Amino acid sequence: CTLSAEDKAAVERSKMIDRNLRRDKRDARRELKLLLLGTGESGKSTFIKQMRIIHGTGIIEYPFDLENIIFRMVDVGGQRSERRKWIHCFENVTSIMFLVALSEYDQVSDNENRMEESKALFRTIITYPWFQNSSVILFLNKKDLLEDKILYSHLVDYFPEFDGPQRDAQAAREFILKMFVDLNPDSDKIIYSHFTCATDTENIRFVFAAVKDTILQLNLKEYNLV
Amino acid sequence: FKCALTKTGFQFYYLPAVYILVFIIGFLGNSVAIWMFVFHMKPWSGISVYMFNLALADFLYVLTLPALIFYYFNKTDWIFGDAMCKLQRFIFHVNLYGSILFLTCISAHRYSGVVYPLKSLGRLKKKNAICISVLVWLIVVVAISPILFYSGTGVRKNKTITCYDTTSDEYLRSYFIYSMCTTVAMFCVPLVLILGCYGLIVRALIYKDLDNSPLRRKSIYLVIIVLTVFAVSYIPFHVMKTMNLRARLDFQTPAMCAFNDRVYATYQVTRGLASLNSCVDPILYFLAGDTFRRRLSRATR
Amino acid sequence: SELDQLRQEAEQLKNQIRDARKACADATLSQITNNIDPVGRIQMRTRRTLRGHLAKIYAMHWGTDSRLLVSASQDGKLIIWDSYTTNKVHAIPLRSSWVMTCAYAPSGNYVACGGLDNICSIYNLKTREGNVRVSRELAGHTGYLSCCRFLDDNQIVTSSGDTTCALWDIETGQQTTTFTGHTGDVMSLSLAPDTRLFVSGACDASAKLWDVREGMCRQTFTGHESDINAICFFPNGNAFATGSDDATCRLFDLRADQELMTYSHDNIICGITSVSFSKSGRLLLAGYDDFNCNVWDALKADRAGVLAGHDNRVSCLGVTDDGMAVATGSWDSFLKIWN
Amino acid sequence: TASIAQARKLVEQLKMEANIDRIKVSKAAADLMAYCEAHAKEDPLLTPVPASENPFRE
Amino acid sequence: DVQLVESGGGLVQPGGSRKLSCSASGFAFSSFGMHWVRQAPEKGLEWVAYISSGSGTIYYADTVKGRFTISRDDPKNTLFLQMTSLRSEDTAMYYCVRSIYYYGSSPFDFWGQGTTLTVSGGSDIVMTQATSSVPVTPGESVSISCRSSKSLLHSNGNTYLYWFLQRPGQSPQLLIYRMSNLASGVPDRFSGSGSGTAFTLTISRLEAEDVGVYYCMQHLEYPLTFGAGTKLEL
Ligand SMILES: CSc1nc(N)c2ncn([C@@H]3O[C@H](COP(=O)(O)OP(=O)(O)O)[C@@H](O)[C@H]3O)c2n1
């Protein structure tokens, strides 16, 4: 029409860029953002190393390919900011991955153990309006260390709610999981959890099943099936 | 001879009431559903456009109802001309079949998104959904066009014009064979699809992937009731229509006549069941509360 | 001993600074602008709509020619827009998909972006190989890059999550001067037309003035009570406005050390995410979080015009250097250009 | 304790900020008003330019 | 660095077919619109064929329309050129020319070395170059004028006028890529001017390197036609 040769060529270049962007969007439709949150004492680094082995500063991402779908987790533990100005960038995530140490119910500065800080972080991150359509994954590492450590320290001295099998190495874990789930507000959000050890083969399979179930529930909400 | 006289007037007496009730309830339901769909949803998906197409088909259905309601009100008489009866029957049949096909497409989409969520993640697009929708519109239109040709108006022995939705007793055998073939092809295969998809999604839901997964009992019950309401109306309606056209050929004997009258009455009740099912299906689909009822309540407030 | 004495001396010094600021407040702008006619109501229409992004965007910056745009989204793509012909000039892939700021050089030779990656990548648009690739990675920040502004072809000021601002050099690749003194986390930057000095805002409701050459703070503004994430110099350069999270804007004066008027109304509860000035400075534009953009009069403090555009957080309010267009992006991956 | 250095830096910052000459707010307000009045006749946002001079009419 | 070397050249009997390929390296070949310009022994440069990025837009000149085809292989990073039938008018040295188009872009940045092969005009814009040789002295002011059939000023506000200089014995290079702006790698002594039709090129402090042949190009209309060729001789 009235467009010149330079204008026509620029429009053609813009259309090519749009086609490339559409192809990239189609490719990105098969990848899901998984916000990974946890303290520095939760063994995040060895957790990612174990996941990489099982599969085969600034933030870092770990793409894994399983059944032709890509999972990536962003490690935002290195950010020392207030976390209330950049957490909205993860509004469109599918699930939030939490790693809480099983051997941190007595280690403390301000006369407070690390479990209280983890509970406060979980409470202040679930209540965020950004994470209203994303599920929760609660990984619990160093399972073997908890069995040996429970013989020395007791949860009664710190949390006055653990009554029953004081020395069992199997009930305190259920109790801490239960109280962590209790932080869920009136908005019913599914909190997946797993009892993983330092060396295991189901570490990636559990998160695969969890993200599959999260996508299934999102589809059920989308498909008017609840 | 032929059993022209119909002793069972209870069908023609009770039928206008059920159609007018269906008319009013489906009119309000379709109006509110379309108003939601056209203003209060900016983002749309494949299941969303499938539900919108189903709602539009049901709206065309409910606007088709008043003509049949007035036709069946006093007696078997059509005040308007042959063209009005032709168009009304054509739109009635095409809307019914489009609603059935939209239910089948919704079920297929749900099966793909539930049984293989990650495998089908990114496989379904807006363009693909639109292409499938327009393809099903065109295929239903070209499948009901022979019904459009076969329809007509014929003079009855009661001196009242009969709005024959199927045949004027002229091409009865050819119409019967064509209708049987079309009903088989575009109902049984969709029936196989609907049954298999609901069975597989029910199996997937009962086979929970993880212990932490939420309870699926409500969704399973909703799927079962949707399948039941779909099955108890459309299958009886189709099979009894097939029986009616079969009886119009090798039955209607002066020796025995009560069987034909009872078959006609059961055909009428199955037609009423199909109409009420096609009316309640958009309402039942909408009234689930996963993402629609809450936003509709927000829209009103 | 000594810490308590120093703290109380600092408190007394702040009190006497506030007393001196109040003493020189002879008259506000309300009693002296009653002799001029107000502008009234104005209407702006979306002349251009730029829809080519996949994820939510957070940054934009106009050029000197007022025709080229740059926008950063969460899809890991930086693309150059055309404000006139509605075309994508470039499409720069990003090694990190988490960026919160973008900067366009006044000469147009370079473009910068930053965010959660803690690296302010510099991309050379005028590349002899055609494809736009990274030129220098401005690494060495412990926080997330919140704002980026170009003042020269080799100098750039970048804010980060470490509650400080840094001046970088692309050629050397190392920061030159570090602006320390911000107790809160800096979120926005603004460069004065004279380019000699710039002001920044942080989470402590304090606007600290900085000098590029001096490298140390000279002026401090404390007029807000909530987090401040938007700032913009006046065209005259003797004033600036800040957009905080409590739905208020104050026209702080460099030579008066005090705010002039409060730009707020009782019908708004959400926060402000971006503020910008017009070419003349009479018209003030603020980007709110109510899925809407509002316009305030700098001399009368009135809502002179409402921009009903996108339906999500704007975060991308900007004005051309020549005051011809007002581009307004949002999280819906859309860029609306107003006039 | 490293808080002593922070405290002394802060008190020095306030001390140097105190020794800053401040003009009357009325004069600065008048100057800003005069600048806005002078630039009012040239601002396209304040005064709607015709479509001929507006490059966004198309 | 950007390198464009041609191959597949040599003498061939008229009426045959020859395959010409230029290898591209040092730049994004998939994002550049490749051209084809030949240097006739008794004439100047003239456009032959052009292909866009990704083989999107493929246009040909009226002279070689249908007879000449152009194909590019992005994975192979090599531009190909196939000719159906050759004639005496096609005996020249083709140039593998790259070009990228956007706002502020400079078309025709790098020109290929070229290869030599031997055998044994409607609704277009023509550049009127009255002068052919301009004898000047080094360090003086040199002005070169050019004109077109119709005004090159479009509704956008800028004219599409291109200037080229071909050194004796090597490929030319771009000097001016718009009305009054300078290209990349060109010293700031050049300064274009005009009023829409009377295109002029002002040269100040001319050195011995400017002995090449100048060329005038228009781009408002797609068919690219070079100028007569102003050969500056000291
Ligand atoms: C022998 S009992 C009986 N009674 C009627 N009133 C009928 N009206 C129509 N039919 C038959 O029903 C078919 C289509 O008419 P219907 O839509 O079923 O009923 P109407 O709307 O009243 O025409 C025709 O091919 C006839 O075979 C009827 N059959």
Side-chain angles (χ1 to χ4, degrees), chain A residues 1-40 42-52 55-66 68-79 81-103 105-107 109 113-116 118-143 146-185 188-201 203-226, chain B residues 3-4 6 8-9 11 14-26 28-74 76-126 128-155 160 162-164 166-168 171-172 174-240 242-289 291-293 295 297 299-300, chain C residues 1-2 6-8 10-18 20-27 29 32-40 42-94 96-128 130-170 172-195 197-212 215-224 226-302 304-339, chain D residues 1-3 5-11 13-20 22-23 25-51 54-56, chain E residues 1-12 14-41 44-64 66-72 74-75 77-82 85-88 90-112 114-139 141-146 148-183 185-187 189-190 192 194-204 206-220 222-234:
Chain A
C1 305
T2 187
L3 265 68
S4 79
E6 281 289 326
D7 299 333
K8 279 181 299 180
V11 170
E12 183 178 1
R13 171 183 173 87
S14 160
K15 298 310 181 33
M16 196 151 200
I17 291 180
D18 294 4
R19 163 176 166 265
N20 290 318
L21 286 178
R22 285 177 298 183
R23 177 189 270 132
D24 273 30
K25 171 213 291 295
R26 176 179 57 90
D27 292 340
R29 271 197 294 261
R30 294 178 65 88
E31 64 92 20
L32 311 173
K33 314 179 304 175
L34 307 164
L35 175 58
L36 198 148
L37 292 167
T39 56
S42 292
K44 186 187 304 179
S45 44
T46 182
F47 177 42
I48 319 288
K49 300 294 187 291
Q50 183 62 255
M51 293 177 71
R52 272 184 165 180
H55 181 224
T57 175
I59 66 179
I60 191 66
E61 293 179 353
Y62 301 97
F64 316 99
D65 46 45
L66 278 80
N68 290 318
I69 190 167
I70 281 292
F71 314 106
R72 62 177 182 178
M73 283 73 74
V74 294
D75 284 341
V76 288
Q79 298 298 111
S81 298
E82 283 154 31
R83 206 209 309 274
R84 65 179 177 88
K85 309 291 304 203
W86 53 268
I87 204 66
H88 48 82
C89 310
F90 310 92
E91 175 161 41
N92 303 127
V93 300
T94 52
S95 88
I96 314 166
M97 260 183 68
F98 263 88
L99 184 62
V100 176
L102 287 186
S103 284
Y105 50 91
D106 55 355
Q107 297 175 356
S109 177
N113 49 1
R114 291 170 180 170
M115 277 267 174
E116 184 60 44
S118 287
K119 182 174 72 68
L121 165 78
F122 192 80
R123 187 49 199 211
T124 194
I125 202 79
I126 295 300
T127 186
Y128 274 141
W130 324 110
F131 313 112
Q132 279 285 333
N133 290 318
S134 45
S135 87
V136 184
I137 306 184
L138 187 63
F139 272 98
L140 295 177
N141 216 7
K142 57 206 54 172
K143 182 176 71 175
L146 173 58
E147 193 267 332
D148 290 330
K149 187 169 176 289
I150 205 60
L151 312 179
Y152 293 99
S153 198
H154 295 269
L155 280 179
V156 184
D157 317 318
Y158 309 98
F159 309 107
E161 293 83 3
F162 183 68
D163 311 324
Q166 193 177 21
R167 187 164 62 250
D168 216 331
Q170 292 179 356
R173 63 182 293 166
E174 313 301 6
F175 157 71
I176 51 155
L177 181 48
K178 187 269 183 182
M179 48 162 195
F180 264 116
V181 176
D182 291 331
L183 276 297
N184 217 311
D188 199 350
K189 301 205 308 177
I190 297 89
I191 301 182
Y192 305 93
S193 301
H194 192 210
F195 293 143
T196 181
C197 180
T199 43
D200 52 338
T201 81
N203 197 15
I204 189 73
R205 290 202 316 128
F206 164 77
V207 72
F208 194 27
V211 299
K212 165 169 309 177
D213 191 279
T214 299
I215 290 305
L216 197 149
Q217 199 71 30
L218 274 178
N219 291 332
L220 287 184
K221 294 181 176 67
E222 173 190 349
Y223 298 161
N224 216 6
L225 293 182
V226 188
Chain B
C3 276
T6 62
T8 54
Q11 290 312 305
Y14 296 161
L15 200 157
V18 65
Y19 280 175
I20 190 167
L21 186 137
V22 159
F23 173 65
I24 192 66
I25 190 183
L28 282 71
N30 283 313
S31 55
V32 298
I34 301 299
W35 181 64
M36 294 298 102
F37 266 107
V38 304
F39 310 161
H40 305 63
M41 283 74 75
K42 194 181 262 271
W44 266 14
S45 66
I47 201 69
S48 161
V49 299
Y50 282 151
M51 293 180 183
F52 176 65
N53 281 296
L54 170 82
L56 184 60
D58 195 43
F59 196 53
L60 292 174
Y61 210 90
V62 66
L63 277 296
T64 312
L65 271 296
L68 289 197
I69 285 154
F70 182 76
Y71 159 67
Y72 280 113
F73 185 75
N74 55 5
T76 310
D77 197 2
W78 188 267
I79 179 168
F80 293 100
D82 176 71
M84 295 298 102
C85 171
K86 191 76 68 68
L87 193 141
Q88 286 313 104
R89 297 318 196 144
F90 168 75
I91 62 177
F92 181 93
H93 294 88
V94 71
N95 289 145
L96 192 140
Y97 274 74
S99 86
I100 295 181
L101 264 294
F102 288 154
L103 291 187
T104 309
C105 286
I106 285 176
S107 163
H109 202 276
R110 288 172 175 177
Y111 158 80
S112 68
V114 164
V115 180
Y116 310 105
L118 300 188
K119 294 181 176 67
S120 84
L121 203 54
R123 185 179 67 189
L124 303 164
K125 277 74 69 177
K126 296 296 292 180
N128 193 319
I130 286 277
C131 166
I132 293 299
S133 161
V134 299
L135 192 141
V136 75
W137 292 97
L138 278 71
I139 199 154
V140 172
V141 166
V142 304
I144 309 291
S145 61
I147 288 286
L148 185 44
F149 302 139
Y150 281 138
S151 178
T153 309
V155 183
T160 60
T162 309
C163 176
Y164 286 109
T166 76
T167 309
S168 66
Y171 292 159
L172 194 58
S174 188
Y175 178 86
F176 159 69
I177 190 67
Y178 151 77
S179 176
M180 183 278 288
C181 281
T182 309
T183 292
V184 165
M186 185 179 288
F187 160 76
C188 184
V189 188
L191 183 69
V192 167
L193 288 174
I194 192 70
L195 286 168
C197 289
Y198 288 169
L200 284 175
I201 66 168
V202 160
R203 168 177 96 163
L205 287 175
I206 66 188
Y207 285 7
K208 302 208 324 173
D209 215 2
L210 277 168
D211 291 331
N212 304 95
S213 299
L215 190 78
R216 296 301 162 66
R217 212 153 300 257
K218 187 269 183 181
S219 162
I220 289 157
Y221 288 160
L222 185 70
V223 170
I224 301 299
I225 65 159
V226 167
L227 184 52
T228 300
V229 66
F230 186 88
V232 298
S233 87
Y234 281 132
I235 317 174
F237 162 72
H238 291 61
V239 67
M240 295 299 291
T242 302
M243 294 299 291
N244 221 44
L245 282 71
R246 179 57 155 61
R248 287 307 174 266
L249 292 181
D250 307 289
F251 288 170
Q252 217 133 204
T253 304
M256 65 182 179
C257 190
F259 180 75
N260 293 268
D261 214 326
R262 78 185 218 191
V263 162
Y264 173 76
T266 43
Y267 179 53
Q268 298 311 112
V269 310
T270 51
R271 284 179 66 188
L273 284 177
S275 162
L276 64 92
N277 190 2
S278 182
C279 172
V280 298
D281 277 341
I283 310 176
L284 175 76
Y285 271 54
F286 192 96
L287 277 296
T291 302
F292 305 72
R293 185 177 65 246
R295 295 179 66 250
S297 66
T300 53
Chain C
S1 66
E2 193 56 70
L6 210 45
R7 281 182 170 89
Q8 67 94 30
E11 294 196 309
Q12 181 264 329
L13 199 52
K14 295 194 317 162
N15 213 357
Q16 69 88 29
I17 297 169
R18 292 188 296 272
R21 289 164 176 179
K22 181 151 291 313
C24 68
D26 203 304
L29 266 167
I32 69 182
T33 49
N34 286 353
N35 293 319
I36 63 178
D37 303 338
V39 63
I42 74 182
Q43 302 84 0
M44 290 201 210
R45 297 285 75 78
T46 302
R47 305 308 169 97
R48 302 296 191 276
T49 300
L50 303 175
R51 32 165 56 94
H53 272 290
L54 317 179
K56 318 175 297 178
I57 74 172
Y58 293 100
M60 61 79 71
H61 180 217
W62 274 96
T64 53
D65 47 352
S66 307
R67 185 176 179 178
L68 289 181
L69 283 72
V70 57
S71 287
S73 57
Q74 291 298 333
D75 63 358
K77 298 293 183 182
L78 201 71
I79 62 170
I80 304 297
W81 291 101
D82 200 357
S83 161
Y84 284 178
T85 80
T86 317
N87 291 297
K88 299 190 184 59
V89 184
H90 290 107
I92 297 89
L94 263 60
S96 88
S97 179
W98 310 94
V99 298
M100 293 177 71
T101 178
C102 82
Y104 182 76
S107 60
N109 296 295
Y110 290 101
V111 57
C113 73
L116 296 172
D117 57 329
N118 298 67
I119 289 179
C120 181
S121 279
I122 317 290
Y123 301 102
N124 190 23
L125 294 176
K126 314 299 175 57
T127 316
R128 276 292 301 178
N131 45 359
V132 182
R133 81 292 183 276
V134 76
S135 61
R136 179 66 65 192
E137 299 90 10
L138 304 179
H141 269 300
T142 62
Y144 69 100
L145 288 149
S146 79
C147 197
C148 279
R149 279 296 163 266
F150 271 104
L151 73 164
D152 279 326
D153 213 38
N154 212 29
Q155 276 180 318
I156 175 169
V157 292
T158 70
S159 287
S160 296
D162 44 7
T163 69
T164 192
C165 296
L167 168 64
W168 295 80
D169 269 22
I170 297 89
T172 61
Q174 327 301 353
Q175 65 183 357
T176 298
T177 59
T178 305
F179 309 96
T180 58
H182 261 288
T183 61
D185 176 27
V186 287
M187 289 306 299
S188 61
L189 288 165
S190 179
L191 287 176
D194 58 78
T195 300
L197 61 83
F198 74 100
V199 65
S200 177
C203 296
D204 52 355
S206 80
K208 301 286 280 296
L209 182 75
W210 309 91
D211 294 75
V212 176
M216 61 79 71
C217 170
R218 271 180 43 162
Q219 270 198 42
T220 298
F221 300 86
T222 58
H224 278 167
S226 197
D227 189 349
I228 294 181
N229 47 2
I231 206 157
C232 205
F233 268 104
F234 205 75
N236 208 341
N238 304 331
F240 70 103
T242 61
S244 45
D245 293 1
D246 51 313
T248 190
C249 290
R250 300 189 187 274
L251 186 61
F252 295 114
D253 205 329
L254 276 297
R255 302 178 300 178
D257 287 329
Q258 56 192 288
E259 61 86 20
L260 268 298
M261 292 180 183
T262 300
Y263 305 118
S264 66
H265 207 349
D266 309 288
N267 289 319
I268 192 66
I269 312 300
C270 75
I272 310 170
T273 182
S274 179
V275 67
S276 198
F277 272 99
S278 59
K279 181 180 51 183
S280 158
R282 176 67 179 271
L283 208 70
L284 177 57
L285 322 182
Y288 290 86
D289 291 331
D290 58 351
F291 315 147
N292 178 275
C293 176
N294 202 344
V295 172
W296 302 91
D297 194 8
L299 276 70
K300 303 301 292 297
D302 296 322
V306 191
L307 272 67
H310 314 260
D311 53 352
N312 210 351
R313 184 151 315 182
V314 165
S315 78
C316 276
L317 182 63
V319 186
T320 67
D321 291 331
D322 54 0
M324 194 42 81
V326 176
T328 297
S330 296
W331 291 10
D332 50 0
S333 64
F334 294 135
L335 291 171
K336 285 181 174 56
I337 292 180
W338 309 77
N339 201 329
Chain D
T1 300
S3 198
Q6 303 194 310
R8 70 169 52 97
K9 173 193 158 254
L10 183 63
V11 65
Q13 185 69 253
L14 277 296
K15 283 174 71 175
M16 61 79 71
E17 276 175 29
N19 290 318
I20 291 181
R22 298 173 179 86
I23 63 169
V25 71
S26 183
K27 187 179 186 295
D31 284 329
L32 262 71
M33 185 180 120
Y35 176 82
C36 279
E37 193 264 345
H39 276 249
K41 263 182 81 204
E42 201 260 329
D43 197 8
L45 282 72
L46 188 63
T47 61
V49 288
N54 180 33
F56 297 92
Chain E
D1 207 349
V2 194
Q3 182 183 10
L4 290 170
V5 65
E6 283 90 319
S7 283
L11 74 163
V12 60
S17 278
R18 193 57 155 211
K19 188 68 178 294
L20 263 68
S21 44
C22 50
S23 315
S25 44
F27 78 108
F29 176 72
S30 282
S31 177
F32 265 83
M34 299 312 285
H35 285 259
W36 269 116
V37 181
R38 54 163 164 247
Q39 183 66 41
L45 295 159
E46 67 170 41
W47 177 65
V48 172
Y50 156 79
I51 192 165
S52 277
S53 66
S55 313
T57 288
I58 298 102
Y59 291 171
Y60 303 98
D62 58 356
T63 287
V64 298
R67 196 173 75 256
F68 263 83
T69 181
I70 178 175
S71 45
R72 68 191 310 175
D74 274 356
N77 207 336
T78 295
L79 181 63
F80 298 101
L81 180 68
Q82 179 63 259
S85 60
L86 298 183
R87 67 184 68 188
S88 44
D90 293 356
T91 299
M93 182 201 48
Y94 293 83
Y95 280 143
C96 184
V97 191
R98 72 167 199 174
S99 194
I100 184 181
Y101 308 95
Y102 53 85
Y103 177 69
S105 159
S106 280
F108 307 94
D109 289 313
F110 195 66
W111 291 57
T115 187
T116 62
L117 73 165
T118 55
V119 305
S120 44
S123 71
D124 292 352
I125 300 184
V126 291
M127 314 324 279
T128 62
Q129 283 190 337
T131 180
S132 159
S133 297
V134 182
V136 292
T137 81
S141 44
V142 181
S143 199
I144 301 180
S145 183
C146 177
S148 74
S149 297
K150 69 179 183 179
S151 159
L152 296 195
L153 177 59
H154 212 183
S155 288
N156 47 10
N158 66 326
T159 62
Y160 292 165
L161 163 75
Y162 300 154
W163 281 102
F164 294 88
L165 193 151
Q166 183 178 2
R167 281 75 178 272
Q170 69 187 25
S171 304
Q173 62 167 339
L174 171 76
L175 265 66
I176 314 294
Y177 72 100
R178 216 74 70 183
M179 176 57 147
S180 66
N181 54 33
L182 296 171
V186 173
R189 66 185 183 273
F190 301 89
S195 282
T197 59
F199 301 134
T200 187
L201 184 64
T202 299
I203 299 101
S204 315
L206 184 139
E207 294 87 11
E209 196 67 28
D210 292 331
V211 298
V213 180
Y214 283 74
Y215 288 99
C216 195
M217 185 180 288
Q218 54 66 45
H219 182 74
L220 183 63
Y222 177 77
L224 309 169
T225 49
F226 292 78
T230 307
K231 179 179 180 180
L232 264 68
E233 182 65 26
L234 274 193

